[PDB]
Write an enzyme that holds these catalytic residues in place. Structure first.
Site, mmCIF file in Angstrom:
data_model
loop_
_atom_site.group_PDB
_atom_site.id
_atom_site.type_symbol
_atom_site.label_atom_id
_atom_site.label_comp_id
_atom_site.label_asym_id
_atom_site.label_seq_id
_atom_site.Cartn_x
_atom_site.Cartn_y
_atom_site.Cartn_z
ATOM 1 N N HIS A 19 -1.589 -1.401 2.527
ATOM 2 C CA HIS A 19 -2.574 -0.731 1.669
ATOM 3 C C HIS A 19 -2.008 -0.521 0.291
ATOM 4 C CE1 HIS A 19 -5.398 2.164 0.129
ATOM 5 N NE2 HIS A 19 -4.551 3.205 0.149
ATOM 6 N N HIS B 4 -2.761 1.565 -3.296
ATOM 7 C CA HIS B 4 -3.511 2.588 -4.031
ATOM 8 C C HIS B 4 -4.016 2.027 -5.371
ATOM 9 C CE1 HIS B 4 -1.660 6.395 -2.016
ATOM 10 N NE2 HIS B 4 -1.471 5.417 -1.169
ATOM 11 N N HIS C 186 1.122 -5.194 10.757
ATOM 12 C CA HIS C 186 1.207 -4.118 9.772
ATOM 13 C C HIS C 186 0.006 -4.147 8.836
ATOM 14 C CE1 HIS C 186 5.336 -3.390 10.953
ATOM 15 N NE2 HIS C 186 5.538 -4.680 10.889
ATOM 16 N N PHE D 176 8.677 1.863 4.735
ATOM 17 C CA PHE D 176 7.974 0.570 4.503
ATOM 18 C C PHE D 176 7.001 0.688 3.311
ATOM 19 C CE2 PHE D 176 6.342 -3.220 7.342
ATOM 20 C CZ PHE D 176 7.096 -4.118 6.633
ATOM 21 N N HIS E 293 -8.478 8.166 0.014
ATOM 22 C CA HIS E 293 -8.142 6.774 0.289
ATOM 23 C C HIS E 293 -9.182 5.831 -0.195
ATOM 24 C CE1 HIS E 293 -6.293 3.575 2.897
ATOM 25 N NE2 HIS E 293 -7.448 3.062 2.466
ATOM 26 N N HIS F 136 -4.541 12.690 -0.216
ATOM 27 C CA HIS F 136 -4.964 11.427 -0.837
ATOM 28 C C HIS F 136 -6.379 11.089 -0.451
ATOM 29 C CE1 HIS F 136 -4.825 7.233 -2.093
ATOM 30 N NE2 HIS F 136 -4.792 6.713 -0.872
ATOM 31 N N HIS G 267 2.072 0.239 0.716
ATOM 32 C CA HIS G 267 2.827 0.529 1.921
ATOM 33 C C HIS G 267 2.063 0.124 3.151
ATOM 34 C CE1 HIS G 267 0.403 4.174 2.901
ATOM 35 N NE2 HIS G 267 0.344 4.361 1.588
ATOM 36 N N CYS G 268 2.808 -0.003 4.250
ATOM 37 C CA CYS G 268 2.173 -0.091 5.555
ATOM 38 C C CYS G 268 1.504 1.233 5.877
ATOM 39 C CB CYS G 268 3.220 -0.411 6.627
ATOM 40 S SG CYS G 268 2.379 -0.579 8.246
ATOM 41 N N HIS G 269 0.266 1.187 6.363
ATOM 42 C CA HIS G 269 -0.490 2.395 6.681
ATOM 43 C C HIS G 269 -0.291 2.893 8.106
ATOM 44 C CE1 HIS G 269 -3.306 5.594 5.788
ATOM 45 N NE2 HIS G 269 -3.609 5.102 4.605
ATOM 46 N N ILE G 270 0.619 2.280 8.870
ATOM 47 C CA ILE G 270 1.121 2.914 10.086
ATOM 48 C C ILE G 270 2.043 4.025 9.589
ATOM 49 C CG2 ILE G 270 2.490 2.634 12.156
ATOM 50 C CD1 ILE G 270 1.323 -0.340 12.226
ATOM 51 N N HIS H 36 5.703 4.047 10.081
ATOM 52 C CA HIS H 36 6.435 3.013 9.337
ATOM 53 C C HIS H 36 6.631 3.403 7.875
ATOM 54 C CE1 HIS H 36 4.973 -0.218 12.398
ATOM 55 N NE2 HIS H 36 5.682 0.737 12.978
ATOM 56 N N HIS I 183 -6.794 12.172 3.623
ATOM 57 C CA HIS I 183 -5.734 12.511 4.574
ATOM 58 C C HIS I 183 -4.560 13.092 3.862
ATOM 59 C CE1 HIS I 183 -3.486 8.689 3.629
ATOM 60 N NE2 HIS I 183 -4.659 8.047 3.685
ATOM 61 N N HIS J 9 -0.920 13.196 2.612
ATOM 62 C CA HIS J 9 -0.034 12.115 2.173
ATOM 63 C C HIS J 9 1.368 12.704 1.895
ATOM 64 C CE1 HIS J 9 1.080 8.139 1.031
ATOM 65 N NE2 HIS J 9 -0.143 7.674 0.803
#
Ligand SMILES: *[C@@H]1O[C@H](CO)[C@@H](O[C@@H]2O[C@H](CO)[C@@H](O)[C@H](O)[C@H]2NC(C)=O)[C@H](O)[C@H]1NC(C)=O
Ligand SMILES: *[C@@H]1O[C@H](CO)[C@@H](O[C@@H]2O[C@H](CO)[C@@H](O)[C@H](O)[C@H]2NC(C)=O)[C@H](O)[C@H]1NC(C)=O
Ligand code: CU
Ligand code: CU
Ligand code: CU
Ligand code: CU
Length: 497
Positions: A400, A402, A397, A463, A67, A65, A452-455, A458, A110, A112
């Protein structure tokens, strides 16, 4: 050197020791972080990704992806596995062929697929502006002014035990740093400046989890960009930067020639700077080659507060100036229990058929789309508001979206919304218990866009949801290349699906 906008990118396994501890990794371009991919605004990027992975402990499939790039008309190139494509299998390659109209700033790329980016597949992605409105604020802006902040784990991502707490083993600044335990005096990164010059430092969080309190002893930092969006100048002496966020700041090399500590304190893992953890070195040309002797203050004078940021351009806020003042006002119920996250009562588990392929095959309502309850339709040409009230464990959290950036109408730790001039960005901390961080955007980009949460841990634990934006126009808007159509049959054959 920077690569792109047309380039090959090989994904390999190798051993690395960025904190003195050797472990295998998943790497782009042979390095951690990966090489900087760069071009100019409006350019055609053609990144032909060669999957050469052989070690199943970190997954031999991959998907990348880009980002923060909107991918308008190229949703198939966005990268999230099982949302916009099936993964690329080992021994195969895939050309991510897209354009970046109307965007210029600091991005990153990164894996994905699963938690694979934590194993090393992460790097910067810069879209320069030949007519940048901020150009006169600095003298130097190049590969030497990019600052990456990364969490690094000794345990492989797929091997993190079910049921134990996950924390990192080192903070890496520009790929180097020291381990929190069994610390050895491994090399620290050096950022070099010349007395009297001004630098556009491009600060990129490539974190899988922690946020960092970033500062430079003796210096302050003038923010000019937030997640790709030019800002009015905002001078701070510390930046709390959450996973996947970016800032550009002007660094004025206006202190005595010498060595200064660069500090990046994560919210978990090692606390402080003993043995040179959480540290890098700002070295002026002509300084002695030795460690800094500087200290941080006890209390920072001018920490970044998100509500202090404002766009450089007159971006405003779409919709009406009150809660729910949008065509499609949403409030998400974000929760955690028993090891899994959920959104509106549904934990995200990636589907067998990517969401985009389901739509292209004729599934035209979101109730029809798998996973059931995880895909929400958005209407075209409409103002969307999404409230993201915090409280779920594991915070704060960083959410993010897309395909889009968004106005941050309400930020963490402040109950007052801003319908006039808030910053726009693409990853936002939703804050703490009782907060009501809220975003707005308009739907002018047909396709399925992950939220989604970018942790990353998670996201893996569910998430996420998919916004199927303008389902009816997705097929016409996003013609797909044969190579993309070939991905799912090849993946399903290789995996006996
Ligand atoms: C966050 O803001 C949203 C609106 O953006 C609030 O949503 C309202 O919630 C109440 C019930 O709690 C409903 O009766 C309304 O229909 C919702 N929309 C409105 C008023 O516009 C939400 O309550 C807020 N959450 C928190 C935790 O403050
Ligand atoms: C909390 O957030 C609000 C809204 O973004 C901030 O209020 C703005 O403050 C600026 C600076 O004084 C004023 O120009 C604006 O008119 C305010 N807008 C609104 C809607 O009130 C506020 O400063 C933030 N609080 C803190 C402590 O930073
Ligand atoms: Cu990302
Ligand atoms: Cu993204
Ligand atoms: Cu999270
Ligand atoms: Cu994503």
């Amino acid at each position: 050197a920077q690569i792109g906008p047309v380039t090959d990118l090989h994904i390999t396994n190798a051993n690395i020791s960025p904190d003195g501890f050797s472990r295998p990794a998943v790497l782009a371009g042979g390095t951690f972080p990966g090489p900087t991919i760069a071009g100019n605004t409006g350019d055609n990027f053609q990144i032909t990704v060669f999957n050469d992975l052989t070690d199943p402990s970190m997954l031999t499939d991959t998907s990348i992806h880009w980002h923060g790039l909107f991918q308008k008309g190229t949703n198939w190139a966005d990268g999230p596995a099982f949302v916009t494509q099936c993964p690329i299998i080992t021994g195969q390659s895939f050309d991510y062929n897209f354009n970046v109209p109307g965007q210029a700033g600091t991005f990153w790329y990164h894996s994905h697929l699963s938690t694979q980016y934590c194993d090393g597949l992460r790097g910067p992605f810069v879209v320069y502006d030949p007519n940048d409105p901020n150009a006169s604020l600095y003298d130097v802006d190049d590969d030497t002014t990019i600052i990456t902040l990364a969490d690094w784990y000794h345990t492989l991502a797929q091997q993190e035990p079910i049921g134990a707490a996950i924390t990192a083993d080192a903070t890496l600044i520009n790929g180097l740093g020291r381990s929190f335990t069994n610390t050895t005096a491994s090399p620290l990164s050096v950022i070099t400046v010349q007395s009297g010059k001004r630098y556009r430092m491009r600060l990129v969080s490539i974190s899988c989890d922690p946020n960092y309190l970033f500062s430079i002893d003796g210096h302050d930092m003038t923010i000019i960009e937030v997640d790709g969006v030019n800002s009015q100048q905002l001078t701070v002496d510390q930046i709390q930067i959450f996973a996947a966020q970016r800032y550009s700041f002007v660094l004025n090399a206006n202190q005595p020639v010498g060595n200064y500590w660069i500090r990046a304190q994560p919210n978990s893992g090692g606390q402080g700077f003993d043995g040179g953890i959480n540290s890098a070195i700002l070295r002026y040309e002509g300084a002695t080659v030795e460690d800094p002797t500087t200290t941080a203050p006890t209390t920072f004078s001018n920490p970044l507060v998100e509500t202090d940021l404002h766009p450089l351009a007159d971006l405003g806020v779409p919709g009406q100036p009150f809660r729910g003042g949008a065509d499609d006002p949403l409030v998400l119920n974000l929760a955690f229990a028993n090891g899994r996250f959920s959104i509106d009562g549904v934990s995200f588990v990636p589907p067998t058929v990517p969401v985009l392929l389901q739509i292209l095959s004729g599934a035209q309502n979101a109730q029809d789309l798998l996973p059931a309850g995880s895909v929400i339709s958005l209407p075209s040409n409409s103002v969307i508001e999404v409230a993201l009230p915090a409280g779920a464990a594991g915070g704060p959290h960083p959410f993010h979206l897309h395909g889009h950036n968004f106005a941050v109408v309400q930020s963490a730790n402040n109950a007052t919304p801003n319908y006039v001039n808030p910053i726009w960005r693409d990853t936002v901390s939703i804050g703490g218990t009782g907060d009501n961080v809220t975003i707005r955007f308009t739907t002018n980009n047909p396709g399925p866009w992950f939220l989604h949460c970018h942790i990353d841990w998670h996201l893996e634990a569910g998430f996420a949801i998919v916004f199927a934006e303008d389902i009816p126009d997705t097929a016409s808007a996003n013609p797909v290349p044969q190579a993309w159509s070939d991905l799912c049959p090849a993946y399903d054959q290789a995996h006996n699906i």
